[PDB]
Amino acid sequence: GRDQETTGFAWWSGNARLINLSGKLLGAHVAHAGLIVFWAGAMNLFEVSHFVPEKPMYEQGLILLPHIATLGYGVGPGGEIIDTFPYFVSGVLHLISSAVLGFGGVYHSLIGPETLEESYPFFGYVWKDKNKMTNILGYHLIMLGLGAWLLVWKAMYFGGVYDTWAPGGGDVRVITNPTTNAAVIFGYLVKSPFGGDGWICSVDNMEDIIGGHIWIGTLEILGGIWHIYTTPWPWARRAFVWSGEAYLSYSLGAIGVMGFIACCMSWFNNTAYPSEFYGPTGPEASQSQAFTFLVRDQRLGANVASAQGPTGLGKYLMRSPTGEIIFGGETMRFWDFRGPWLEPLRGPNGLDLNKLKNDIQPWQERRAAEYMTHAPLGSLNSVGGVATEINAVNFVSPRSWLACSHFCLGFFFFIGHLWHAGRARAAAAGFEKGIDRFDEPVLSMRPLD
Amino acid sequence: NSSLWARFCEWITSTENRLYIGWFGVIMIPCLLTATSVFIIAFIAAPPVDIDGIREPVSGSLLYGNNIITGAVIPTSNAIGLHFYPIWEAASLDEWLYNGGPYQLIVCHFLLGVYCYMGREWELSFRLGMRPWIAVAYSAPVAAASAVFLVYPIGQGSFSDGMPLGISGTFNFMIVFQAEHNILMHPFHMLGVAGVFGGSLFSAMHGSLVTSSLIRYNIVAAHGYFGRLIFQYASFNNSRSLHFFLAAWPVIGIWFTALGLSTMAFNLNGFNFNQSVVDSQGRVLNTWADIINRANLGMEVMHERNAHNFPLDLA
Amino acid sequence: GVLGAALLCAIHGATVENTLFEDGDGANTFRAFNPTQAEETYSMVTANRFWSQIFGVAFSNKRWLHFFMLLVPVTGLWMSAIGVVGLALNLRAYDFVSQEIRAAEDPEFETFYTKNILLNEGIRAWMAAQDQPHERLVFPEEVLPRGNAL
């Protein structure tokens, strides 16, 4: 390694010493990738060893198996689990690949050349080259596009994906006709993020997801080919800082925005995140409680339509501010929730009274009861329910954990963008160490502001 | 000479102005002034707003039998939920007033204004040849404001759960939040309280030590005094280290308390310790945590008088 | 006062650490400081200009700045102590008579103040049963204040 005198960076900033050491930086990146893959494999194996297939996944606090199940591995109709071997296979494959990646990282960090700008000119790069950086960006864009097309092929040819909107309970299906229409695909991006619209979190079918992934894979391949054979235009050079920390800051900002989007999507979406694996969402639990109470009261004998509440609005059914028939009570805020177990009861103008009378199947009632029981509410002690509850339950929904953790990570990475962008701009300007003390810019300015 | 745009950008990015109108300023100023104008007009006079969505409004305007302490800009109606509710989407202006549009308008413009204010802080730091990390410190109150006004409504699914823009609204929101989430028992609120108390302590101590050492730039005698006092010699003898610690403590505390707020926004409450100490037979022994639970239970039953209609408060 | 003290601490730390003079080489600025030096380690003029152009008003005297940092929290806690002294004799700033009268007269009048009053009443009634055993209070479930909506 190095020391402070040679580099100028203290131990608590030691990784900053690798900015101009391509070999060591590459070794560090490879070792970190090996760490990521190792955690993936180890956690997959841990969840497999503790998984009881009889109980639902969301009732055991599993966060990685739901992804593989959504991919459509070892899952039958309604989310029932047939066998758990594919999860074991994925875990062991990630584990061994992580072993290989870790060996590569430790080699490139300890034995490999410190700087590879002259021995391996293809892999060498200067942070201000402005042409090799685009080459690397194009290579990785092509790789990302290949990954997206791999997902598309998995959903289209090799087996299928878990469609939760299939008739009855959802099941594995092949997406024979993905939605490739440009208008439909690009309507999501420009849609408003507020309530009712929800931006890309409003995808409600697997066809749209697969078509969008086709689009993004093709666009990424084309963009990679573009960037390999091109250098940034003068207007691009005019409005960017060309240094390693600047690129790091750009990536930090983008990935923080990605973390926020992931938080919102995990909390709200239930198509790419089936409730049979991740548990019911926030609105889903309340809607399910209202539906179950309405069904029970109607079975006991009552007029659900003519059931005026204490405030006069309506105990069971009322009207939304747009005009649709919705469940009444404090759940009015969740009136735009949509779920496979509730849609068959919806007509052109909201919930249909006639369908609510004699068109409710037993599976819908059972799913509603199960979801209303396991609300996303929880506690830091893994208690469950409202804060004023006894210690009798050990449930916190995986959706809550995912949302909280990824929001925290996104916020910290936005802070990282701020810090690193500011420092990169200052260092490129040249005053990141301090004021000159002999050519101070303020002293040459007109006083009184 | 130079074109129109060159002169315009020279004027905008000029350090000779009394107040720096940065490129972030060009958005900060209109949004902040719009929010200020709407807030002032609504506070002075605005009809009662149906916060609960149950056809009963609450008044928070001075012209409607209120004072400074009890006045507030009532949050958006529950029936609206998270829907965007601009002026042009309402049939009439009075309907916009009734449903609680001004709160949404003020919140949106104010959040944009504070984000651009942080950006402008960075910009003027850059234009004067300074190290640009004042904005990083300023982000902590910005993060707290975003969690209070935006993240919590998103997690709870409605803007009616946000903080009202009024003094009594703050206390009502705090009582509500403690009742529903047990804020006091969360480690992140404890860290925020620790950060605030430590900020006050270090502010007072640093002020006293520096002022006492400014005899007829701090001398080394203050370090010796501090070492003799609390038996922490060499803990802080570098001025840069001391001032960095002063900056770092409260910022980290506020970051963590804002993160705890945003975490509870997604129904991840604090610690639960009721019914923990149990007799040998099986009887439950009360603890101070159980008295806190009793207070929370009392807060919860009178939470919404006529809004709920189901046994469990899932919303 | 307490929040202002925390704010002053944060701003003073950030401003001092972001206006240092380039007194040494390398990026680690902490090492570029001699405790025995007789020269200022940060530019007061630059900080003054920055805060006067961002906020509108900025400090120009070090002694006054540090005395203000000393003075804010001390005053805040002294005033809190006076308030607690007032509470010790049940001299409470509990209610506003005008709004209470208006709410009693008009059943449609609701403000956040009245909701806070209701929450306080609920706290008292539901907590005094076990908080103060020496009163031997036994409240029937039908007299405890409770939102009738359930």
Binding site: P447, L448 | R18, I44, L62, L63, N67, I68 | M44, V45, N48, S52, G56, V57, A58, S60
Partner: peptide, 30 residues
């Protein structure tokens, strides 16, 4: 009446803030 008093107090405070920001004593020899 009382609303007018509150409005006058707030307007006066804002005016004092404006005067302090703009009609300030120029700082010399920082």
């Amino acid at each position: 009446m009382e609303a007018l008093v509150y409005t006058f107090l707030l307007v006066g405070t804002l005016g004092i803030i404006f005067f302090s920001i703009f009609f300030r004593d120029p700082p010399r020899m920082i």
